[PDB]
Amino acid sequence: GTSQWLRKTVDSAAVILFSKTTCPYCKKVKDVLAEAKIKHATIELDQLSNGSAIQKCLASFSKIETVPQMFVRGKFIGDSQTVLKYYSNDELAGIVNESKYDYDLIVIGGGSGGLAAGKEAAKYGAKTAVLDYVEPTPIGTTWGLGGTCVNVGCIPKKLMHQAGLLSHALEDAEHFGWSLDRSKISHNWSTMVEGVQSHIGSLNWGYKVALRDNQVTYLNAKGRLISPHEVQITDKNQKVSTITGNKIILATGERPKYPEIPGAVEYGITSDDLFSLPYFPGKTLVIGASYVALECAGFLASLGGDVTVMVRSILLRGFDQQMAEKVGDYMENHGVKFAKLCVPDEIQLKVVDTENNKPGLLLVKGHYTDGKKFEEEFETVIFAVGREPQLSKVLCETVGVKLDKNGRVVCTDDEQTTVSNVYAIGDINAGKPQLTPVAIQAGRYLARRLFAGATELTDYSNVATTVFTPLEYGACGLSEEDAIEKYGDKDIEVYHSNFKPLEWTVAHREDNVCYMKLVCRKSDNMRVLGLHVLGPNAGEITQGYAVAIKMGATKADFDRTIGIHPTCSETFTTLHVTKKSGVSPIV
Amino acid sequence: GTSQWLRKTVDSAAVILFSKTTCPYCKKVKDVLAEAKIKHATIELDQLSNGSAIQKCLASFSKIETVPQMFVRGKFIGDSQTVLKYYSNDELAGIVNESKYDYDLIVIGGGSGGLAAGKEAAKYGAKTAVLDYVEPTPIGTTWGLGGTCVNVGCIPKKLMHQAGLLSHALEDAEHFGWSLDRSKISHNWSTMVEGVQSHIGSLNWGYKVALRDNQVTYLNAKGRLISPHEVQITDKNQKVSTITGNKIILATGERPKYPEIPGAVEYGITSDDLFSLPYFPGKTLVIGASYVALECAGFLASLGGDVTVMVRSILLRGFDQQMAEKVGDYMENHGVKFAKLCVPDEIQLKVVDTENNKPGLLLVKGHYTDGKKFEEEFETVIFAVGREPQLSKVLCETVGVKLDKNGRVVCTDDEQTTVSNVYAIGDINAGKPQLTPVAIQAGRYLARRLFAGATELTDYSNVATTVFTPLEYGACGLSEEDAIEKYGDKDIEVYHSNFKPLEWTVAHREDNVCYMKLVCRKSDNMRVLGLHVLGPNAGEITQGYAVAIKMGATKADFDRTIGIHPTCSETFTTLHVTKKSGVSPIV
Ligand SMILES: Cc1cc2nc3c(=O)[nH]c(=O)nc-3n(C[C@H](O)[C@H](O)[C@H](O)COP(=O)(O)OP(=O)(O)OC[C@H]3O[C@@H](n4cnc5c(N)ncnc54)[C@H](O)[C@@H]3O)c2cc1C
Ligand SMILES: Cc1cc2nc3c(=O)[nH]c(=O)nc-3n(C[C@H](O)[C@H](O)[C@H](O)COP(=O)(O)OP(=O)(O)OC[C@H]3O[C@@H](n4cnc5c(N)ncnc54)[C@H](O)[C@@H]3O)c2cc1C
Ligand SMILES: COCCNC1CCN(C(C)=O)CC1
Ligand SMILES: COCCNC1CCN(C(C)=O)CC1
Ligand SMILES: COCCNC1CCN(C(C)=O)CC1
Ligand SMILES: COCCNC1CCN(C(C)=O)CC1
């Protein structure tokens, strides 16, 4: 038990000191390592109820039972007198750098998860390398260090969402007394892109500085695992070489899919291209119905564009479908057109003019599920029909890492693959929510278990989400249909209400469009199984409730907590209308 | 136990039916009452684990042990056969209206608490009257039904706060690509007031409609309790009369104080006057340092005004003083001037011109705590030096209701005064947080205990707050200094961080001004004693965390919950820098 943990810790830590906070001999070893700038993990035995037991187990490796004890990569180095001897004789630098491998850790993929894992491991003295490379899109788009979220995801998406939101603030201002005239103001796409891209540039540079300051080696190279400990790297000159590492973390993410039709790759774009596009897209077709599709369509319309969304079946598959329909209804009332139950069959009438900053023109042909035909011209066509990994480029199948039927890595609950020294984190971890804060938490927690003897696992359940459509949708836990499927309609109670933000009153916005509900399990003290809210700032509203749901909140916990007035969020503290009662939810 | 509860319930309920959901004789009595439009409370004995015991106790009043049993104001009316007999013989209307008093409930005060209490009591068949009157301010300002929050408080304050916030949205828009020029846009005060006042007007009317639709009598009259059951009312013609009631709820609120100096009442105004002022105040002095003072100063500056705040000692006395100082520092960097350690001694140079919509001009003289002199001219002087009840106008001291040294009503934990049939709720309840949602919860819960046999008490602990200064400040639980005083510095750990909203990046706003912290008790599993956040949308951020603190969240509960990205609120899920460590909190 304790003995099993200690063996695992000693074997995988790079440099680790067993100590006590009250021991001057430990302090003198700490000072020597600090001064030689040797980084290491420290385990303070007097701060663990298990400490006396661990102290005895140490003797199985060192034959001594006292503190301090220093280990390097599984080898007992010495006690106080012995470490200071190596220091005085200038033997200590060569002792702590001695390794069977080039690196204690190689991270393949320099995005949300991989950067977090790499920086946290180097905190504890692991010799670490982070590999990152960006395969260009079909039209040649590329970007800097940091992954999908930073460069072509959460960060630019929310900044352009904010640009769309400011449209409505400009309209609202006249009602609150400001002298501007909204009808005489227009938007400049290229000015917005320049500002967004300048912020992303500071993030790329910030990550390079952070790695250098943690003594992490950054290689801008394409990595391929060719045996359990060997990574083949190809650089920007196509020079090829091999590096070795003790532990391997796979963190290579995903990229957008294209449908298998004529013209798609040649004449359409994806979200990868949109966030740095030099010209306004113009009349735009978005094919797909995921949150990427709806978020992108939504801000394009708020920035004055003519936007159509082509929906194969339903909006936001996998989310609560009542809330998905209210989301789409809001977008349709505020400009966005929808081609429902429709798929494309083929896509060129005019070539893009990059010198004069003008889109081309495309003819899109498709059909509806009843057989009727679709045909219409667009300047830009954006595909948002999902994302997939490409692990055949990352992973020789003879290494023995097991993949599932979607090509994602099958992992134990501590992120281990079927090869004992190889782990996987982030979007390529089969079955996990595909989100940036999940990837960061997995990576940081994993590095602590490998190199600092930590035990805490990542908790993947009830992770909250927000869809940043023009009216935002936040959620935590089960959709209503999923709760009813799992427990039965008789055992589910739903409390709900419409609401109107106070900010919408003087501005003359709509009365009964914002909405919220709690899905509860009757037979478990009315436990809150799922929380759902459509309204402004939905992400800020939802976040704090995710802690309470993590601890098992019930309806009674929401009732006894007092609201903050005036806010949108306070409506959750006084809900009382149930769906079973048939009483209207309007304000 | 059960017997004691049942006696209390039967004695104070107006009309109550003891029933079972599976009994057709109960359903036929329900239908008869429903059809005669007799409102009543219902207690379903098969839905309480205590039901069999209650069924036997019923026989102490009726000599029968079966359901249904109908009671009116403490008197057993009959079983099924007997109730339908009264109905068939047209004796039932006169049986349920029979009362020793005019009303089952008289509520004195028609604001946040009083309106909530009155409407909830009439739900259960209590014959109810709500009295409301608005004493005019020194210059003659008055307003309609609904209390301080609706008319001269939370509602207009936040709407003018929103008007100030839109200033910064107008500036931000150019950076996000919109073609407006902020420097050429001005604000029109009277246009804003017209819109704010139109919304308040719809609230006044909405409350009158709601009372009529619940069969509550609304009397626009000044009430005075002259004996335990007698209320003297004076109407708008000074006609005087007396009405009687079984239960009395006092809910009369507070009004602004004036300092005892020459010129204050004659030439200054308070928040009561500001929210409907026909002209822009111009160059304005705000005397005081409470949240009212800072909120009002803050939006006046955002609307283009020249604003000074005169502070006797500290800002936001009673709130966390580190956060109070960051609040004030932000206001000072964005325009607001401060006269620190200063008090006024006397206040006319020009009379207000109401025909041409122009303020007057005043000379203010004062002194600093070291003895130096203050002297300066202002167009408007606003006093925000606290609020107080005036219960000598509400309450003959011979009734025997006990007051504390501040003139607030001393209450038991179920809101009872020292007179057994008289209760107090809202701002006049001594020792309670003075907030609109506390008053609403107290009133609704109290009406259910009086007239529906409920037992749940209002929980007054750890009630969250938000100060709507230009940069908002939300909090829940203990300030840091209060936690250190109660538990000792050694037992307190503080995790904190600066942050920057993603929306501030492209807009080039400040890097290290937003701030958050968790104050935790080491010896109680790092329990979160207090949460503090300075930033945009602080009220929406804080609300949901109040549920988790109500259930006793620890630091580990915050760590294991995953963030929503990108939001301000997610920074609470990854805090790690402690104050004890001395590590900088900057981004
Ligand atoms: C449009 C869009 C919007 C999104 N919005 C949000 C949002 O609001 N909130 C949220 O939580 N999530 C959002 N996401 C999801 C989020 O981007 C991902 O969940 C997250 O980036 C996953 O991180 P990761 O570490 O798994 O991979 P990534 O961040 O994708 O990083 C992987 C990196 O590895 C590189 N790489 C690949 N193969 C190799 C190789 N062989 N050698 C070297 N390097 C390689 C890739 O080029 C990339 O740089 C969004 C995603 C998209 C597409
Ligand atoms: C400027 C300002 C801003 C505020 N902002 C907020 C905020 O953002 N959030 C928040 O939670 N709280 C806020 N508050 C506090 C909130 O207004 C009060 O806590 C709340 O109104 C208390 O309600 P109440 O029922 O106790 O009394 P009130 O709402 O004051 O109602 C009492 C009513 O009784 C009437 N009355 C008095 N005497 C008699 C009599 N003898 N006969 C008949 N009627 C009588 C009064 O005229 C009044 O109409 C603010 C207060 C102020 C002053
Ligand atoms: C067969 O190997 C091709 C490798 N592709 C990439 C292209 C250039 N890369 C970078 C670092 O941009 C790294 C290698
Ligand atoms: C005065 O010059 C105006 C610029 N001419 C542009 C050239 C490019 N055009 C395209 C590509 O359709 C549009 C007209
Ligand atoms: C001595 O009694 C004076 C009563 N003052 C008020 C003035 C007029 N009121 C209203 C309802 O506006 C009610 C009575
Ligand atoms: C053309 O008329 C302009 C209005 N004249 C106003 C009259 C009132 N004045 C005061 C009260 O100072 C200011 C000048």
Coordinates of N, CA and C in Angstrom, one line a residue, chain A residues 149 154-155 158-159 162-163 166-167 169-170 172-174 176-180 182 184-188 191-192 195-196 199 302-303 436-438 441 444-445 459 463-466 468 502-503 505-506 537 539-548 550-553 557-570 573-574, chain B residues 149 154-155 158-159 162-163 166-167 169-170 172-174 176-180 182 184-188 191-192 195-196 199 302-303 436-438 441 444-445 459 463-466 468 502-503 505-506 537 539-548 550-553 557-570 573-574:
Chain A
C149 N -6.8 26.2 -29.3 CA -7.6 27.2 -28.5 C -7.0 28.6 -28.7
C154 N -10.9 28.9 -29.0 CA -11.6 29.7 -27.9 C -11.2 31.2 -28.0
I155 N -9.9 31.5 -28.1 CA -9.4 32.9 -27.9 C -9.9 33.8 -29.1
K158 N -13.9 34.0 -29.1 CA -14.6 34.8 -28.2 C -14.3 36.3 -28.4
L159 N -13.2 36.6 -29.0 CA -12.9 38.0 -29.3 C -13.8 38.6 -30.4
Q162 N -17.2 39.0 -29.0 CA -17.3 40.3 -28.3 C -17.5 41.4 -29.3
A163 N -16.9 41.3 -30.5 CA -17.1 42.3 -31.5 C -18.6 42.4 -31.9
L166 N -20.8 44.0 -29.3 CA -20.8 45.5 -29.2 C -21.7 46.1 -30.1
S167 N -22.1 45.4 -31.2 CA -23.2 45.9 -32.0 C -24.5 46.3 -31.2
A169 N -24.6 46.8 -27.9 CA -24.3 47.8 -27.0 C -24.4 49.2 -27.7
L170 N -24.0 49.3 -28.9 CA -24.2 50.5 -29.7 C -25.7 50.9 -29.9
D172 N -28.1 49.8 -27.8 CA -28.7 50.1 -26.5 C -28.3 51.5 -26.0
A173 N -27.2 52.0 -26.5 CA -26.7 53.3 -25.9 C -27.6 54.4 -26.1
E174 N -28.3 54.5 -27.2 CA -29.2 55.6 -27.5 C -30.3 55.6 -26.5
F176 N -30.2 54.7 -23.5 CA -29.7 55.1 -22.2 C -29.2 56.5 -22.1
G177 N -29.5 57.3 -23.2 CA -29.2 58.7 -23.3 C -28.0 59.1 -24.1
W178 N -27.2 58.2 -24.7 CA -26.0 58.6 -25.5 C -26.4 59.1 -26.9
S179 N -25.7 60.1 -27.4 CA -26.1 60.8 -28.6 C -25.8 60.1 -29.9
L180 N -25.2 58.9 -29.9 CA -24.8 58.3 -31.2 C -26.0 57.8 -32.0
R182 N -26.9 54.6 -34.3 CA -26.4 53.3 -34.7 C -26.5 53.1 -36.2
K184 N -25.7 54.8 -38.6 CA -24.7 55.4 -39.4 C -23.3 54.8 -39.1
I185 N -23.2 53.7 -38.4 CA -22.0 53.0 -38.0 C -21.8 51.7 -38.7
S186 N -20.6 51.4 -39.2 CA -20.3 50.2 -39.9 C -19.1 49.5 -39.3
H187 N -18.9 48.3 -39.7 CA -17.8 47.5 -39.2 C -16.7 47.2 -40.2
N188 N -15.4 47.2 -39.8 CA -14.3 47.0 -40.6 C -13.6 45.7 -40.2
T191 N -9.6 45.6 -39.7 CA -9.2 46.2 -38.5 C -9.4 45.3 -37.3
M192 N -10.5 44.5 -37.2 CA -10.7 43.6 -36.1 C -9.7 42.4 -36.2
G195 N -6.3 43.3 -34.8 CA -6.2 43.4 -33.3 C -6.2 42.1 -32.7
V196 N -7.1 41.2 -33.2 CA -7.2 39.8 -32.7 C -5.8 39.1 -32.9
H199 N -3.0 40.2 -30.5 CA -3.1 39.5 -29.2 C -2.6 38.0 -29.3
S302 N -23.8 39.3 -36.7 CA -23.8 40.5 -35.9 C -22.8 41.6 -36.5
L303 N -21.8 41.2 -37.3 CA -20.9 42.1 -37.9 C -21.4 42.5 -39.3
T436 N -10.5 22.9 -23.3 CA -9.2 23.4 -23.0 C -8.9 23.3 -21.5
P437 N -9.8 23.7 -20.5 CA -9.4 23.5 -19.1 C -9.4 22.0 -18.7
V438 N -10.1 21.1 -19.3 CA -9.9 19.7 -19.0 C -8.5 19.3 -19.4
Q441 N -5.9 20.7 -16.8 CA -5.9 20.0 -15.6 C -5.3 18.5 -15.7
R444 N -1.4 19.0 -16.0 CA -0.7 19.4 -14.7 C -0.7 18.3 -13.7
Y445 N -1.9 17.7 -13.5 CA -2.1 16.6 -12.5 C -1.2 15.4 -12.9
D459 N -10.9 14.7 -12.4 CA -12.3 14.3 -12.3 C -12.9 14.8 -13.6
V463 N -18.5 18.3 -16.0 CA -17.7 19.4 -16.4 C -18.6 20.4 -17.2
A464 N -18.7 21.6 -16.7 CA -19.6 22.7 -17.2 C -19.1 23.2 -18.6
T465 N -20.0 23.7 -19.4 CA -19.8 24.1 -20.8 C -20.5 25.5 -21.0
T466 N -20.0 26.3 -22.0 CA -20.8 27.4 -22.5 C -20.6 27.5 -24.0
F468 N -21.1 30.1 -27.0 CA -21.0 31.5 -27.1 C -21.7 32.0 -28.4
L502 N -32.3 43.1 -16.3 CA -32.7 44.5 -16.1 C -32.1 45.4 -17.2
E503 N -30.9 45.1 -17.7 CA -30.3 45.9 -18.8 C -31.1 45.9 -20.0
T505 N -34.4 46.3 -20.2 CA -35.7 47.0 -20.0 C -35.7 48.3 -20.7
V506 N -34.8 49.2 -20.3 CA -34.7 50.5 -20.9 C -34.4 50.4 -22.4
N537 N -23.9 36.7 -20.6 CA -22.9 36.3 -19.6 C -23.1 34.9 -19.1
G539 N -21.6 32.1 -19.3 CA -20.4 31.5 -18.7 C -20.1 31.9 -17.3
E540 N -20.2 33.2 -17.1 CA -20.0 33.7 -15.7 C -21.1 33.3 -14.8
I541 N -22.3 33.2 -15.3 CA -23.4 32.7 -14.4 C -23.2 31.2 -14.0
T542 N -22.8 30.4 -15.0 CA -22.8 28.9 -14.7 C -21.7 28.5 -13.9
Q543 N -20.5 29.1 -14.0 CA -19.2 28.6 -13.4 C -19.4 28.2 -12.0
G544 N -19.8 29.2 -11.1 CA -19.8 29.0 -9.7 C -20.8 27.9 -9.3
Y545 N -21.9 27.7 -10.0 CA -22.8 26.6 -9.7 C -22.1 25.2 -10.0
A546 N -21.1 25.2 -10.8 CA -20.4 23.9 -11.0 C -19.7 23.3 -9.8
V547 N -19.3 24.2 -8.9 CA -18.7 23.8 -7.6 C -19.8 23.1 -6.8
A548 N -21.0 23.8 -6.7 CA -22.1 23.2 -5.9 C -22.6 21.9 -6.4
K550 N -20.7 19.8 -8.2 CA -19.7 18.8 -7.8 C -19.8 18.3 -6.4
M551 N -20.3 19.1 -5.4 CA -20.5 18.6 -4.1 C -21.9 18.1 -3.9
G552 N -22.7 17.9 -4.9 CA -24.0 17.3 -4.8 C -25.2 18.2 -4.3
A553 N -25.3 19.4 -4.9 CA -26.4 20.3 -4.5 C -27.7 19.6 -4.8
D557 N -30.7 23.1 -1.4 CA -29.5 24.0 -1.3 C -29.7 25.3 -2.1
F558 N -30.4 25.2 -3.3 CA -30.6 26.4 -4.0 C -31.7 27.3 -3.4
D559 N -32.7 26.7 -2.7 CA -33.7 27.5 -2.1 C -33.2 28.3 -0.9
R560 N -32.3 27.6 -0.1 CA -31.9 28.3 1.2 C -30.8 29.3 0.9
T561 N -30.1 29.3 -0.2 CA -29.2 30.4 -0.6 C -29.9 31.6 -1.0
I562 N -29.4 32.8 -0.6 CA -30.1 34.0 -0.9 C -29.5 34.7 -2.2
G563 N -30.4 35.3 -3.0 CA -29.9 35.9 -4.3 C -29.2 37.2 -4.1
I564 N -28.4 37.6 -5.1 CA -27.8 38.9 -5.3 C -28.7 39.7 -6.2
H565 N -29.1 40.9 -5.9 CA -30.0 41.7 -6.6 C -29.4 43.1 -7.0
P566 N -29.5 43.5 -8.2 CA -30.2 42.8 -9.4 C -29.2 42.1 -10.3
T567 N -29.4 40.8 -10.5 CA -28.6 40.0 -11.4 C -29.5 39.0 -12.2
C568 N -29.0 38.5 -13.3 CA -29.7 37.4 -14.0 C -29.6 36.1 -13.1
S569 N -28.4 35.9 -12.5 CA -28.1 34.6 -11.9 C -29.1 34.3 -10.7
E570 N -29.5 35.4 -10.0 CA -30.3 35.2 -8.8 C -31.6 34.4 -9.1
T573 N -32.2 31.1 -7.5 CA -32.4 30.8 -6.1 C -33.8 30.8 -5.7
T574 N -34.8 31.2 -6.6 CA -36.2 31.3 -6.2 C -37.1 30.5 -7.2
Chain B
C149 N -36.1 49.9 -3.0 CA -35.4 49.3 -4.1 C -36.0 49.6 -5.5
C154 N -32.1 49.9 -5.7 CA -31.4 48.9 -6.6 C -31.7 49.1 -8.1
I155 N -33.0 49.3 -8.4 CA -33.5 49.3 -9.8 C -32.9 50.6 -10.5
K158 N -28.9 50.6 -10.7 CA -28.3 49.7 -11.6 C -28.5 50.2 -13.1
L159 N -29.7 50.8 -13.3 CA -29.9 51.2 -14.7 C -29.0 52.4 -15.1
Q162 N -25.6 50.9 -15.6 CA -25.5 50.4 -17.0 C -25.3 51.6 -18.0
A163 N -25.8 52.7 -17.8 CA -25.6 53.9 -18.7 C -24.2 54.3 -18.6
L166 N -21.9 51.8 -20.5 CA -22.0 51.9 -22.0 C -21.0 52.9 -22.5
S167 N -20.5 53.9 -21.7 CA -19.4 54.7 -22.1 C -18.2 53.9 -22.5
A169 N -18.1 50.7 -23.4 CA -18.4 49.9 -24.5 C -18.2 50.7 -25.8
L170 N -18.6 52.0 -25.8 CA -18.4 52.9 -26.9 C -17.0 53.1 -27.3
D172 N -14.5 51.0 -26.4 CA -14.0 49.7 -26.8 C -14.3 49.3 -28.2
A173 N -15.5 49.8 -28.8 CA -16.0 49.4 -30.1 C -15.0 49.7 -31.2
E174 N -14.3 50.9 -31.1 CA -13.4 51.3 -32.2 C -12.3 50.2 -32.3
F176 N -12.4 47.1 -31.7 CA -12.9 45.9 -32.2 C -13.4 46.0 -33.7
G177 N -13.2 47.2 -34.3 CA -13.4 47.4 -35.7 C -14.6 48.3 -36.1
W178 N -15.4 48.8 -35.1 CA -16.5 49.7 -35.4 C -16.1 51.1 -35.7
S179 N -16.8 51.8 -36.6 CA -16.4 53.0 -37.2 C -16.7 54.3 -36.4
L180 N -17.3 54.1 -35.2 CA -17.7 55.3 -34.4 C -16.5 56.0 -33.8
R182 N -15.6 57.9 -30.4 CA -16.1 58.2 -29.1 C -16.1 59.6 -28.7
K184 N -16.7 62.3 -30.1 CA -17.8 63.1 -30.6 C -19.2 62.8 -30.1
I185 N -19.3 62.0 -29.0 CA -20.5 61.5 -28.5 C -20.7 62.0 -27.1
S186 N -21.9 62.6 -26.7 CA -22.2 63.1 -25.4 C -23.4 62.4 -24.8
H187 N -23.7 62.7 -23.6 CA -24.8 62.1 -22.8 C -25.8 63.1 -22.5
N188 N -27.1 62.7 -22.6 CA -28.3 63.5 -22.2 C -29.0 62.9 -21.0
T191 N -33.0 62.5 -21.0 CA -33.4 61.3 -21.8 C -33.2 60.0 -21.0
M192 N -32.1 59.9 -20.2 CA -31.9 58.7 -19.4 C -33.0 58.6 -18.3
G195 N -36.4 57.4 -19.4 CA -36.5 56.0 -19.7 C -36.5 55.1 -18.4
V196 N -35.6 55.5 -17.4 CA -35.6 54.9 -16.1 C -36.9 55.0 -15.4
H199 N -39.7 52.8 -16.8 CA -39.7 51.4 -16.3 C -40.2 51.3 -14.8
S302 N -18.9 58.6 -15.0 CA -18.9 57.9 -16.3 C -19.9 58.6 -17.2
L303 N -20.9 59.4 -16.7 CA -21.7 60.2 -17.6 C -21.2 61.6 -17.9
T436 N -32.6 43.6 -0.4 CA -34.0 43.3 -0.9 C -34.3 41.8 -1.0
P437 N -33.4 40.9 -1.5 CA -33.7 39.5 -1.5 C -33.8 38.8 -0.1
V438 N -33.1 39.4 0.9 CA -33.3 38.9 2.3 C -34.8 39.3 2.7
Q441 N -37.3 36.9 1.0 CA -37.3 35.6 1.6 C -37.9 35.5 3.0
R444 N -41.9 35.9 2.5 CA -42.6 34.8 1.9 C -42.6 33.6 2.9
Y445 N -41.4 33.3 3.5 CA -41.3 32.2 4.5 C -42.2 32.4 5.7
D459 N -32.5 31.8 6.5 CA -31.1 31.6 6.9 C -30.4 32.9 6.6
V463 N -24.7 35.7 3.5 CA -25.5 36.2 2.3 C -24.6 37.0 1.5
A464 N -24.5 36.7 0.2 CA -23.6 37.4 -0.8 C -24.1 38.8 -1.1
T465 N -23.1 39.6 -1.5 CA -23.4 41.0 -1.8 C -22.6 41.4 -3.1
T466 N -23.1 42.5 -3.8 CA -22.3 43.1 -4.8 C -22.4 44.6 -4.8
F468 N -21.9 47.9 -6.9 CA -21.9 48.2 -8.4 C -21.2 49.5 -8.6
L502 N -10.6 38.7 -21.0 CA -10.2 38.6 -22.4 C -10.8 39.8 -23.2
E503 N -12.0 40.3 -22.8 CA -12.6 41.4 -23.5 C -11.7 42.7 -23.4
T505 N -8.4 42.9 -23.7 CA -7.1 42.7 -24.4 C -7.1 43.6 -25.6
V506 N -7.9 43.3 -26.6 CA -8.0 44.1 -27.8 C -8.4 45.5 -27.5
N537 N -19.0 42.3 -14.2 CA -20.1 41.3 -13.9 C -19.9 40.5 -12.6
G539 N -21.4 40.5 -9.9 CA -22.6 39.9 -9.3 C -22.9 38.5 -9.9
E540 N -22.8 38.4 -11.3 CA -23.1 37.2 -11.9 C -22.0 36.1 -11.5
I541 N -20.7 36.6 -11.4 CA -19.7 35.7 -11.0 C -19.9 35.1 -9.6
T542 N -20.3 36.0 -8.6 CA -20.3 35.6 -7.2 C -21.5 34.7 -6.9
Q543 N -22.7 34.9 -7.5 CA -23.9 34.3 -7.1 C -23.8 32.8 -6.9
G544 N -23.4 32.1 -8.0 CA -23.4 30.6 -7.9 C -22.4 30.1 -6.8
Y545 N -21.3 30.7 -6.6 CA -20.4 30.3 -5.5 C -21.1 30.4 -4.1
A546 N -22.2 31.2 -4.0 CA -22.8 31.3 -2.7 C -23.5 30.0 -2.3
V547 N -24.0 29.3 -3.3 CA -24.6 27.9 -3.0 C -23.5 27.0 -2.4
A548 N -22.3 27.0 -3.1 CA -21.3 26.1 -2.6 C -20.8 26.5 -1.2
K550 N -22.6 28.0 1.1 CA -23.7 27.6 1.9 C -23.6 26.1 2.3
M551 N -23.1 25.2 1.4 CA -22.9 23.8 1.7 C -21.5 23.5 2.3
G552 N -20.7 24.5 2.6 CA -19.4 24.3 3.2 C -18.3 23.9 2.3
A553 N -18.1 24.6 1.2 CA -17.0 24.3 0.2 C -15.7 24.5 0.9
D557 N -12.7 21.5 -3.0 CA -13.9 21.5 -3.8 C -13.7 22.5 -5.0
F558 N -13.0 23.6 -4.8 CA -12.7 24.5 -5.9 C -11.6 23.9 -6.9
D559 N -10.6 23.2 -6.3 CA -9.6 22.7 -7.2 C -10.1 21.6 -8.1
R560 N -11.0 20.7 -7.6 CA -11.5 19.6 -8.3 C -12.5 19.9 -9.4
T561 N -13.2 21.1 -9.2 CA -14.1 21.6 -10.2 C -13.4 22.2 -11.4
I562 N -13.8 21.9 -12.6 CA -13.1 22.4 -13.8 C -13.7 23.7 -14.3
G563 N -12.8 24.6 -14.8 CA -13.2 25.9 -15.3 C -14.0 25.8 -16.6
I564 N -14.8 26.9 -16.9 CA -15.3 27.3 -18.2 C -14.4 28.3 -18.8
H565 N -14.0 28.1 -20.1 CA -13.1 28.9 -20.8 C -13.7 29.4 -22.1
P566 N -13.5 30.7 -22.4 CA -12.8 31.8 -21.6 C -13.9 32.6 -20.8
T567 N -13.6 32.7 -19.4 CA -14.4 33.5 -18.5 C -13.5 34.2 -17.5
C568 N -14.1 35.2 -16.8 CA -13.4 35.7 -15.6 C -13.5 34.7 -14.5
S569 N -14.7 34.1 -14.3 CA -15.0 33.3 -13.1 C -14.1 32.1 -13.0
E570 N -13.6 31.5 -14.1 CA -12.8 30.3 -14.0 C -11.5 30.5 -13.2
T573 N -11.0 28.5 -10.1 CA -10.9 27.0 -10.0 C -9.4 26.6 -10.0
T574 N -8.4 27.6 -10.3 CA -7.0 27.2 -10.4 C -6.2 28.1 -9.5

